[PDB]
């Protein structure tokens, strides 16, 4: 079906303890493939998937230079936003950014996204027209007028419509064995004791999109097994049947607890 | 590949 490439950034200021901690990661669909952490001795963008290691040094140097420039831009933004919100320089604050592009099975661009948060709340975001901003408060409106003046969206829109799609198309080709294959779950049900519980399990599946009494049912968040696979279970307190729907499954499987 | 953009807030 459809695919995606995303880049996540996080800068957390550390007052009196030095320069802010910067961590950025890159995802194709739900697969991590690149990272950069400022808390390393020699900070460089490092690979996290086999299909990305084939890139030459001109790729990794550019990725490292862009990560370091974003860490520098964030350090200035932290101090700038203290002025905007009139906050003390003694407190830790967090700037998050996410940007990326959604492509369909045909390879064209479905949606481009670029959004920033400050202390966990939305700050400014590129609208889906890739041409206008929505700022969350009057301080973000300061950023918005500066970003409109400097024609920031023009570059974002060119990247999301152009470079983002082209490289996502390349990544899926070089990693078609791991990025375009869907691993179905390994479902089983257990019983935990005039009252008891039935637990519908789903283990080792990719991608993360999985569907398992919409009131009394207890459903945990999808968790990674640590080996690129995922897990999920649901519980309720023969007359019960848990529905299992996944893209890697031939049919939506229904299962009852075999005693 | 990553976006090349310098845009202070």
């Amino acid at each position, epitope marked *: 079906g459809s695919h995606s490439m995303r880049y996540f950034h996080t800068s957390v200021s550390r007052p009196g303890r030095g320069e802010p901690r910067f961590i950025t990661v890159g995802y194709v669909d739900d697969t991590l493939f690149v990272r950069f952490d400022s808390d390393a001795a020699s900070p460089r963008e490092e690979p996290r998937a086999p299909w990305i290691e084939q890139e030459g040094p*001109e790729y990794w140097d550019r990725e490292t230079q862009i990560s370091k420039a974003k860490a520098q831009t964030d350090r200035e933004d932290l101090r700038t936003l203290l002025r905007y919100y009139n906050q003390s320089e003694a407190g830790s604050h967090t700037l998050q950014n996410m940007y990326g592009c959604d492509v369909g099975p045909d390879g064209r661009l479905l949606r481009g996204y670029h959004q920033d948060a400050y202390d966990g709340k939305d700050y400014i975001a590129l609208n889906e027209d890739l041409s206008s901003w929505t700022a969350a408060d009057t301080a973000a409106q300061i950023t918005q007028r500066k970003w409109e003046a400097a024609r920031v969206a023009e570059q974002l829109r060119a990247y999301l419509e152009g470079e983002c799609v082209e490289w996502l198309r390349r990544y899926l080709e070089n990693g078609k064995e791991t990025l375009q294959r869907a691993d179905p779950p390994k479902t089983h049900v257990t019983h935990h004791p005039h009252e008891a519980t039935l637990r519908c399990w789903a283990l080792g599946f990719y991608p993360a999109e999985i569907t398992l009494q919409t009131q009394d049912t207890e459903l945990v968040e999808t968790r990674p097994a640590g080996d690129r696979t995922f897990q999920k279970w649901a519980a309720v307190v023969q007359r019960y049947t848990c529905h299992v729907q996944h893209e890697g499954l031939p049919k939506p499987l229904t299962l009852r607890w075999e005693p | 590949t990553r976006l090349a953009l310098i845009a202070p807030k």
Partner: T-cell receptor
Framework: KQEVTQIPAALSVPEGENLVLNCSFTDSAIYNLQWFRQDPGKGLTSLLLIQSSQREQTSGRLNASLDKSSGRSTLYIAASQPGDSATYLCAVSNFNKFYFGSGTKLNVKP | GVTQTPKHLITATGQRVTLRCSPRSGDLSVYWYQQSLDQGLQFLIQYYNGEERAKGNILERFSAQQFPDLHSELNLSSLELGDSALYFC?????????????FGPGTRLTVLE
């Protein structure tokens, strides 16, 4: 490592002629590419700014292209006018470094 | 827009000169460039809101600074004949990679023996 070269170094043409000014660069990890005109008294004036991911820009009779993969930029000047006589320089912005090319000195004869 | 001072400058070797620049109102970033015949337009140094941000191949005997009022100074000391060139000041709103710079008229320096 960045080396920006321009061709031709000079150009003397009749007015009304479509002009092709070429720019080349060796490092493709740029933030933008610009075309400036320099007049002896007024200094440099930006004409077109092509964003990193953009492939072309346009402003009136001016139209420039950008190909980061091959490291080339072409400025097109439609129907040149005597007021276009100046020096045309392409500029690239790299990581913490700005580079200018040798420039094309253009004289549009009336 | 951007203004520079002096416009022209005749000096002798070994001397020291100060080039001044007042950027566009509201611009936080200032840039210095040296345009010579054998090297063309070469980027010297960039200041951003008082902090040095970027440097080209600026000589050890070249010294620059941005002041709290955003106006910039370029000191060229122990001058040589090769220092003869046009020195340009530019300014920009800030550091946007998507925005352009705005150049001043330039200072013309000729150093004679």
């Amino acid at each position: 490592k960045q080396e920006v070269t321009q061709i031709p170094a000079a150009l003397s043409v009749p007015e009304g002629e479509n002009l092709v000014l070429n720019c080349s660069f060796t490092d493709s990890a740029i933030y933008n590419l610009q075309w400036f005109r320099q007049d002896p008294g007024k200094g440099l004036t930006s004409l077109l700014l092509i964003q990193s991911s953009q492939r072309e820009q346009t402003s009136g009779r001016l139209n420039a292209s950008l190909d980061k993969s091959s490291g080339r930029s072409t400025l097109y000047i439609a129907a040149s006018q005597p007021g276009d006589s100046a020096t045309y320089l392409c500029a690239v912005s790299n990581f913490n470094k700005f580079y200018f090319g040798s420039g094309t000195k253009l004289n549009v004869k009336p | 827009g951007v203004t520079q001072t002096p416009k022209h400058l005749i000096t002798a070797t070994g001397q020291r000169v100060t080039l001044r620049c007042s950027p566009r109102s509201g611009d936080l970033s200032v840039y210095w460039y040296q345009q010579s015949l054998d090297q063309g337009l070469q980027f010297l140094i960039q200041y951003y809101n008082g902090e040095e941000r970027a440097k080209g191949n600026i000589l050890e005997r070249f010294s620059a600074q941005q002041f709290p009022d955003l106006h910039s100074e370029l000191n060229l000391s122990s001058l040589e004949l090769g220092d003869s060139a046009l020195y340009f000041c530019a300014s920009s709103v800030a550091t946007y990679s998507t925005d352009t710079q705005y150049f001043g008229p330039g200072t013309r320096l000729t150093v004679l023996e």
